[PDB]
Design an enzyme around this catalytic site. Structure first.
Site, PDB file in Angstrom:
ATOM      1  N   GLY B  16       0.821  -1.191   0.000  1.00 53.43           N
ATOM      2  CA  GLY B  16       0.000   0.000   0.000  1.00 53.43           C
ATOM      3  C   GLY B  16       0.859   1.246   0.000  1.00 53.43           C
ATOM      4  N   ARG B  17       0.190   2.394  -0.051  1.00 51.47           N
ATOM      5  CA  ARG B  17       0.860   3.683  -0.124  1.00 51.47           C
ATOM      6  C   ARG B  17       0.208   4.640   0.864  1.00 51.47           C
ATOM      7  NH1 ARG B  17       0.506   1.264  -4.695  1.00 51.47           N
ATOM      8  NH2 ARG B  17       2.344   0.991  -6.033  1.00 51.47           N
ATOM      9  N   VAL B  19       0.711   9.082   2.561  1.00 55.03           N
ATOM     10  CA  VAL B  19       1.190  10.441   2.327  1.00 55.03           C
ATOM     11  C   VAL B  19       2.711  10.464   2.272  1.00 55.03           C
ATOM     12  CG1 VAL B  19       0.885  12.841   3.008  1.00 55.03           C
ATOM     13  CG2 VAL B  19      -0.827  11.132   3.659  1.00 55.03           C
ATOM     14  N   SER B  20       3.357   9.847   3.260  1.00 58.23           N
ATOM     15  CA  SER B  20       4.804   9.695   3.271  1.00 58.23           C
ATOM     16  C   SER B  20       5.244   8.309   3.715  1.00 58.23           C
ATOM     17  CB  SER B  20       5.451  10.749   4.183  1.00 58.23           C
ATOM     18  OG  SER B  20       6.808  10.961   3.835  1.00 58.23           O
ATOM     19  N   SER B  21       4.309   7.425   4.050  1.00 57.46           N
ATOM     20  CA  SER B  21       4.611   6.090   4.547  1.00 57.46           C
ATOM     21  C   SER B  21       4.153   5.063   3.525  1.00 57.46           C
ATOM     22  CB  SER B  21       3.928   5.838   5.893  1.00 57.46           C
ATOM     23  OG  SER B  21       2.546   6.149   5.828  1.00 57.46           O
ATOM     24  N   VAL B  22       4.994   4.068   3.271  1.00 56.14           N
ATOM     25  CA  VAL B  22       4.716   3.033   2.284  1.00 56.14           C
ATOM     26  C   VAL B  22       4.709   1.684   2.988  1.00 56.14           C
ATOM     27  CG1 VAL B  22       5.170   2.394  -0.080  1.00 56.14           C
ATOM     28  CG2 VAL B  22       6.174   4.482   0.835  1.00 56.14           C
ATOM     29  N   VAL B  23       3.656   0.903   2.766  1.00 54.19           N
ATOM     30  CA  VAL B  23       3.556  -0.429   3.352  1.00 54.19           C
ATOM     31  C   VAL B  23       4.055  -1.453   2.340  1.00 54.19           C
ATOM     32  CG1 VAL B  23       1.969  -2.186   4.182  1.00 54.19           C
ATOM     33  CG2 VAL B  23       1.703   0.187   4.928  1.00 54.19           C
ATOM     34  N   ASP B 139      -8.293   8.226  16.412  1.00 57.14           N
ATOM     35  CA  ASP B 139      -8.240   7.876  14.994  1.00 57.14           C
ATOM     36  C   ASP B 139      -8.746   6.434  14.871  1.00 57.14           C
ATOM     37  OD1 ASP B 139      -7.707   7.440  12.339  1.00 57.14           O
ATOM     38  OD2 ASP B 139      -5.581   7.938  12.434  1.00 57.14           O
ATOM     39  N   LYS B 141     -10.898   5.315  12.249  1.00 63.13           N
ATOM     40  CA  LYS B 141     -11.543   5.221  10.954  1.00 63.13           C
ATOM     41  C   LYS B 141     -11.402   3.806  10.392  1.00 63.13           C
ATOM     42  CE  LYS B 141     -10.387   9.687  11.625  1.00 63.13           C
ATOM     43  NZ  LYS B 141     -11.127  10.962  11.458  1.00 63.13           N
ATOM     44  N   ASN B 144      -8.184   2.823   9.150  1.00 67.53           N
ATOM     45  CA  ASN B 144      -7.285   2.473  10.239  1.00 67.53           C
ATOM     46  C   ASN B 144      -7.483   1.042  10.711  1.00 67.53           C
ATOM     47  OD1 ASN B 144      -5.869   4.970  12.260  1.00 67.53           O
ATOM     48  ND2 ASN B 144      -6.673   5.358  10.202  1.00 67.53           N
ATOM     49  N   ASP B 157      -2.544   2.088  12.695  1.00 65.43           N
ATOM     50  CA  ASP B 157      -2.318   3.533  12.711  1.00 65.43           C
ATOM     51  C   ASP B 157      -2.819   4.174  14.008  1.00 65.43           C
ATOM     52  OD1 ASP B 157      -3.504   2.427  10.004  1.00 65.43           O
ATOM     53  OD2 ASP B 157      -1.874   3.761   9.400  1.00 65.43           O
ATOM     54  N   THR B 176      -9.222  13.001  10.757  1.00 64.12           N
ATOM     55  CA  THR B 176      -9.995  13.398   9.590  1.00 64.12           C
ATOM     56  C   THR B 176     -11.428  13.730  10.009  1.00 64.12           C
ATOM     57  OG1 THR B 176     -10.875  11.243   8.916  1.00 64.12           O
ATOM     58  CG2 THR B 176      -8.553  11.696   8.449  1.00 64.12           C
TER      59      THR B 176
END
Ligand SMILES: C/C=C(\C)CC/C=C(\C)CCC=C(C)C
EC number: 2.7.11.19
Lengths: 986, 371
Positions: B16-17, B19-23, B139, B141, B144, B157, B176
């Protein structure tokens, strides 16, 4: 004292090979005719038919301690040499075709598939037969490498070494070249349409790997006799094999010839899951009780085809369903796969199955039938109940191709031969996992003053001059260098054509005339295009290019990317490194960037831990260059520079690359693109870029929406023609021509890295992609279309790539859903399987009419639901509405019939106008809002479509959604056409 | 160091992708066991200023802390070990072959009562562990929330989490917009309110209930602040035709988490005590007065009679009811939603302008355009 029992039983195999194969070998040429009726020798069949002789000769050589079993081993070995040499003379008599095919990958310049078995001459002409079969030359090239590795001295002269080297460039472009293939008929239709078959792509990959650093003279050879293979083309074939498989082509869901790619003799697939999935797909869709069908809807010798017509009409394809001829040849491949894989169970189920189809003849010897055909009377029975009727053996008897692997499989299954002896190059281990490699990166500075900026940021680099004696060069120079490999003036061979070099080629250390050479990776080349002038794009290309390197390195040593930091990669101020590159450089020192392990260092440190390839052809044009090398306002100027006239390319002086120079420094993308168009600057990897998109079951259309001017790409086009098609489809506007190819790189970039954005688009329409990208950049920063047209030229390549990904991924920066329907029906984005759902609906109807253009149920029988040709037919009907937003209304309207079709037991039995269902749904959407309190102002009509603008903006689901009204109007139309209906299963 | 990362794991494919973190998926070489690695770019491509570079590390250094404070619990991922570099921060955790609940909620628009019960049974039992250890998430959601091949919830998260000092209530706005409790905005719009405590997670969990069982957030509208007044005021409706087919035991538990006033909210321990999450344990004596026995036999009859009556009532799908009102009846409405998310399931993403409610139009256009 006496011969071993292995020798005694080989005599029975010697009799079987002699009585079946070696008795047909031509005395003069060593070639093998296909049969008595077909007195010619096929290149592919002869190579395959000689495997039994080669396996027998290797089997006899295992015990060569007596005069006689030395001699029969010599006979079998040199009979193989005779055929492979005889086949060499056939191809070497067509060196003009090999030279022409290297540069222009056309069918008219291809090596002939069949030759005179008596004189090694061309029996038929360049157009009288389907000649381009890249899996026939590759089956020769693969086994030529393998037979030399086993000790058979086939190549005799250094000129033939040059010929085989030039044959590598002949089969290099197999990933981007359409060919007729293993069955000499091209696509499934059999209409002279060449297609990208996985058999040809797979076979060339194995042949290229087999010939990679192979000494054609054996152990008693030198660097002059070594065939040099570039892993760029080898792994490009992988990118196509991974995308194509388990399919054989865009037209074939599966071919049993893929057994010649997944297991033997290619071993061209590296993912074991792909091998098992493709083998099982062959199992379900092709195998019956008399062999395996070549491919679905084959009809090669089915009694429902006329043997006089060379071509098949489109309607005849449905006549071949379930009654296709079945070839036991592919069951020998499964036996061969079992011996290599080590599945004794597999070598048993396909051995007893093959033993019951083998037709006994002569003095009891088994003969492999070419195919088993359905009797003409029993065709209807197999139409209804599949794979149960008794078939009669027809075609060639014996099938000399299939008979050889039957003996080869028999030899290796009874302990007379090992997989390694028939595969001395160890292709059978292609499926074993390969660990990712550590990519060495030596960041360099073009000037000393750039070394200080990097030093001020803590980056340890050597300057370009400090690396001397190691000297760095552009990737182009390496491409020019290989243009001297295989050059033979007397044979009129010009060496390798100019092809773009990727990282797998440019990450090696090159030893030219004792000077170590490292070449800069091509994506940083700035003279070719403007993708290297965006520093945010250097990181993005570098990020994928390391990722390509780590997962696809198959050479000794570790790859070494020499990354020179240029003045363009600095900031506009000129004293600071750009942040995007600045982040990229420190990222590499920490040891991880783009999913690859980066061991940053100096180029001198990586001399001993790199692929040091000695370029022996440079050892005593490009050599001459290498010999010295070893030893007012800008916007106005274009209006001046385009009103000089059409670009004369001569000295009518009183060199826009100089003008292209400043704009690269100021990085104004609108101006720099215009220069690239008016200089016709063109990318070097669009033909792999188009092919990668093409290999994922997509049709590429470049050009503005109207059909005569928008040209579709369904077959891999060579570099010159594909670029010419784009330029002609550019209708003269140079800005669109670059944007067409610029987006093509980004489409291929996202396709390789994120395949999921194109799962809903079966046709990649670049031409409207600029249009659909224009609208969202028009609505954002609200402005006119012309300002957006000027705006579209102006974004950076990374911003352009992001904005296209903004388009494709479905991320949002008239109305909300009006902007989500003008972006959903303009890209022709349809849900997964919608083309597979129209097939079900049309079988319950007589057709589907859009704006009075019918898509009849006759199409359902004509093409399969999964046929992409059917996807074109449904698509072609759906673009009969010009406005994009209304098309998506039609799209989900089609599905509300699909979901209502499942509930309804009965069939409508007549035409359904998909357009109208929206119209009363517009009308019925009108009534409910009037009743609930809508004014005439809010319910305003769309001027062209006739749909309310609010209906376009309405959400899909809900009480008042668009597909609730269309699930409402998809019933009143069935009221008039179906007086009585029964709805069940809820 | 990065050497320590590759001495134990090897990243194979991108999962996955962010904002600045990539799984990224990896193979643990010693164990050959599937594990997920989240790869946060600390420098963020150069966009991050030294403050954000420092702040992201401190947020990440904190992030290891909470995931180090909770371990061995069935329904939150285990941070197996964490590696920090000058430019990245690698975190290795369990591999969840299936994606977030958002992706699942896209596939199945309305998530069935049985399925959501164990989903949140874990989530509430997740919430109990956080509150007992005194750690709030802020958080919660569905993006998450990660699900595995057995559908088990793996809350992910805790990037916005922070441990309250005993009896302390936060003020920073983290989360959010849709899933923010009413006093989150109220504390954002006033200084008198001294903060919010661990009761924040209760509202966010109750929001998943309306999203999972109906396919839309409880409060959603396209402009930012308008959603907020629906939140603090707390105007929610089990609207028709959608929300009438579900059993009444669902509605009350939804209101309990959705009460605007925090102290009256339905805390996690008693949340699992509401009739929905009651489980049938076979070995119960269940003694009853003679009136209690008489109810059971009467209720056992009342049940059988009921089931025959309810079923007899279901109206088969006919031509006319499709013409008059498709959504009104369940089988066709769930279908319209299902083929709604197959065509435009790419149009639902994370944020405010891409929520699932954008795919539902439950109000007349006139009322929508009233203001
Ligand atoms: C149960 C459906 C009720 C009203 C809708 C009417 C259905 C149809 C009118 C025909 C459309 C598709 C057919 C596939 C076979």
């Amino acid at each position: 004292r006496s011969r071993s029992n292995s020798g005694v039983r080989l005599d029975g195999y010697a009799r079987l090979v002699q009585q079946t194969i070696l008795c047909h070998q031509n005395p003069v040429t060593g070639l093998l005719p296909a049969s008595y009726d077909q007195k010619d020798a096929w290149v592919r069949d002869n190579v395959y038919s000689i495997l039994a002789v080669w396996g027998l000769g290797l089997a006899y050589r295992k015990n060569a301690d007596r005069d006689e079993d030395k001699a029969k081993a010599y006979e079998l070995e040199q009979s193989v040499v005779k055929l492979m040499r005889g086949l060499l003379h056939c191809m070497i008599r067509q060196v003009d075709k090999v030279e022409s095919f290297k540069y222009s990958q056309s069918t008219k310049d291809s090596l002939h598939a069949k030759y005179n078995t008596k004189t090694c001459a061309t029996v038929v002409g360049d157009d009288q037969w389907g000649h381009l079969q890249l899996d026939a030359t590759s089956v020769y090239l693969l086994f030529l490498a393998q037979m030399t590795a086993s000790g058979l001295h086939i190549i005799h002269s250094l000129d033939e070494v040059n010929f085989i080297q030039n044959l590598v460039f002949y089969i290099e472009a197999a990933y981007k070249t359409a060919d007729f293939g293993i069955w000499e008929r091209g696509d499934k239709t059999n209409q002279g349409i060449s297609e990208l078959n996985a058999s040809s792509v797979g076979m060339a990959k194995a042949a290229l790997e087999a010939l990679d650093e192979l000494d054609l003279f054996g152990v008693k050879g030198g660097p002059q006799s070594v065939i040099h293979v570039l892993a760029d083309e080898v792994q490009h074939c992988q990118s196509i094999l991974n995308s194509l498989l388990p399919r054989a082509s865009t037209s074939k869901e599966v071919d049993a010839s893929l057994l010649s790619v997944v297991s033997f003799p290619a071993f061209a697939v590296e993912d074991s899951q792909l091998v098992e999935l493709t083998k099982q797909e062959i199992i379900t869709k092709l195998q019956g009780r008399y062999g395996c069908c070549r491919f679905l809807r084959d009809g090669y010798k089915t009694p429902k085809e006329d043997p006089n017509r060379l071509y098949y009409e489109p309607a005849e394809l449905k006549l071949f369903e379930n009654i296709e001829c079945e070839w036991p040849l592919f069951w020998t491949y499964f036996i061969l796969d079992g011996v290599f894989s080590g599945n004794a169970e597999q070598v048993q189920e396909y051995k007893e199955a093959l033993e019951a189809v083998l037709i006994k003849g002569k003095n009891g010897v088994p003969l492999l039938p070419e195919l088993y055909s359905v009797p003409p009377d029993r065709v209807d029975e197999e139409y209804q109940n599949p794979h149960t009727v008794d078939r009669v053996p027809m075609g060639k008897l014996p099938h000399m191709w299939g008979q050889s692997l039957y003996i080869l499989g028999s030899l290796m299954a009874e302990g007379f031969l090992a997989p390694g002896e028939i595969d001395p190059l160890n292709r059978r281990f292609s499926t074993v996992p390969k660990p990712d490699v550590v990519v060495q990166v030596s960041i360099l500075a073009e000037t000393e003053e750039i070394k200080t900026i990097l030093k001020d940021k803590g980056i340890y680099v050597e300057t370009i001059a400090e690396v001397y004696p190691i000297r760095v060069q552009p990737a182009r120079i390496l491409s020019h260098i290989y243009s001297s490999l295989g050059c033979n003036n007397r044979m009129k061979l010009s060496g390798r054509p100019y092809r773009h070099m990727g990282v797998l080629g440019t990450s090696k250390l090159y030893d030219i005339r004792k000077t170590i050479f490292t070449f800069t990776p091509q994506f940083i080349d700035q003279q070719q295009f403007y993708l290297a002038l965006d520093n945010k794009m250097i990181v993005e290309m570098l990020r994928t290019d390391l990722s390509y390197l780590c997962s696809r390195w198959r050479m000794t040593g570790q790859p070494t990317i020499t990354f020179p930091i240029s003045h363009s990669m600095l900031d506009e101020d000129g004293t600071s490194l750009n942040s995007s590159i600045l982040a990229a450089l420190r990222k590499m020192q920490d040891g991880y960037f783009g999913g690859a392990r980066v061991q940053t260092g100096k180029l001198s440190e990586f001399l001993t831990t790199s692929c040091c390839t000695h370029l022996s052809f440079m050892d005593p044009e490009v050599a001459r260059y290498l010999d010295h090398l070893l030893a007012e306002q800008a916007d106005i100027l274009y209006m001046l520079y385009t009103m000089k006239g059409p670009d004369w390319n001569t000295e009518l002086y009183n060199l826009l690359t100089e003008l292209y120079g400043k704009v690269g420094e100021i990085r104004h993308w609108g101006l720099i693109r215009y220069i690239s168009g008016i200089l016709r600057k063109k990318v070097e990897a669009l033909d792999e870029a188009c092919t990668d998109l093409l290999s994922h079951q997509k049709h590429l259309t470049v050009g503005l929406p109207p059909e005569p001017r928008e040209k579709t790409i369904s077959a891999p086009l060579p570099y010159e023609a594909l670029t010419q098609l784009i330029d002609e489809a550019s209708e003269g506007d140079m800005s669109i021509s670059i944007l067409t190819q610029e987006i093509m790189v980004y489409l291929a970039m996202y396709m390789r890295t994120q395949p999921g954005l194109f799962a809903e688009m079966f046709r990649l329409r670049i031409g409207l992609i600029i249009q659909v990208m224009a609208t969202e950049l028009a609505h954002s920063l609200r402005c006119s279309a012309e300002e957006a047209t000027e705006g579209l030229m102006n974004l950076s390549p990374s911003a352009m790539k992001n904005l296209l990904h903004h388009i494709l991924s479905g991320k949002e920066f008239q109305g909300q859903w009006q902007r989500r329907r003008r972006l959903d029906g303009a890209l022709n984005r349809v849900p997964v399987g919608f083309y597979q759902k129209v097939w079900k609906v049309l079988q319950k109807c007589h057709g589907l009419s859009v704006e009075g253009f019918v898509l009849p149920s006759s199409t359902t029988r004509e093409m399969t639901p999964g046929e992409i040709k059917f996807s074109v037919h449904v698509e072609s009907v759906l673009n009969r509405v010009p406005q994009p937003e209304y098309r998506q209304l039609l799209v989900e309207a089609i599905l509300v019939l699909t979901m209502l079709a499942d509930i309804e037991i009965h069939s409508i039995g007549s035409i359904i106008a998909v357009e109208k269902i929206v119209h009363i749904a517009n009308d019925l959407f009108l009534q409910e809002q009037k009743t609930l309190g809508a004014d005439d102002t809010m319910l305003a009509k769309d001027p062209a479509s006739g749909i309310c603008t609010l209906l376009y903006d309405s959400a899909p689901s809900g009480r008042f959604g668009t597909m609730t009204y269309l699930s409402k109007a998809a019933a009143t139309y069935v009221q008039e056409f179906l007086p009585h209906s029964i709805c069940a299963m809820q | 160091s990065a050497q320590d990362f590759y001495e134990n794991y090897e990243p194979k494919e991108i999962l996955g992708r962010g904002v600045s973190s990539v799984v990224r998926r990896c193979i643990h070489k010693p164990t050959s066991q599937e594990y997920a690695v989240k790869v946060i770019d600390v420098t963020g491509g150069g966009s991050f200023s030294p403050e954000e570079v420092r702040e992201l590390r401190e947020a990440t250094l904190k992030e290891v802390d909470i995931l180090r404070k909770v371990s061995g619990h069935p329904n939150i991922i285990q941070l197996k070990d964490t590696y920090e570099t000058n430019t990245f921060f690698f975190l290795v955790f369990d591999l969840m072959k299936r994606g977030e609940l958002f992706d699942y909620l896209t596939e199945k628009v309305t998530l069935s009562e049985k399925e959501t019960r164990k989903i949140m049974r874990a989530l509430l039992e997740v919430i109990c562990t956080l509150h007992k250890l005194n750690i709030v998430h802020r958080d919660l959601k569905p993006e998450n929330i990660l699900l595995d091949d057995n559908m088990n919830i793996k809350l992910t998260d805790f990037g916005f989490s922070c441990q309250l000092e005993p009896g302390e209530r936060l003020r920073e706005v983290c989360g959010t917009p849709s899933y923010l409790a009413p006093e989150i905005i109220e504390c954002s719009m006033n200084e008198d309110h001294p903060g919010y405590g661990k009761e924040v997670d209760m509202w966010s969990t109750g929001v998943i209930m309306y999203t999972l069982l109906a396919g839309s957030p409880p409060f959603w509208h396209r402009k930012q602040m308008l959603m907020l007044r629906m939140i603090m005021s707390g105007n929610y409706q089990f609207g028709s035709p959608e929300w009438d087919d579900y059993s009444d035991t669902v509605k009350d538990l939804v209101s309990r988490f959705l009460v605007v006033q925090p102290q009256n909210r339905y805390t996690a321990e008693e949340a699992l005590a509401h009739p929905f999450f009651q489980q049938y344990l076979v070995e119960e004596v269940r003694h009853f007065s003679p009136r209690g026995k008489f109810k059971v036999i009467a209720l056992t009859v009342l049940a059988s009679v009921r089931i025959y009556y309810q079923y007899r009532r279901v109206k088969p799908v006919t031509r006319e009811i499709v013409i008059r009102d498709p959504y009104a009846l369940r089988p066709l409405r769930r279908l319209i939603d299902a083929y709604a998310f197959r065509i435009y399931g790419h149009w639902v993403k994370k944020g405010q302008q891409q929520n699932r409610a954008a795919l539902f139009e439950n109000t007349p256009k006139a009322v929508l355009l009233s203001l």
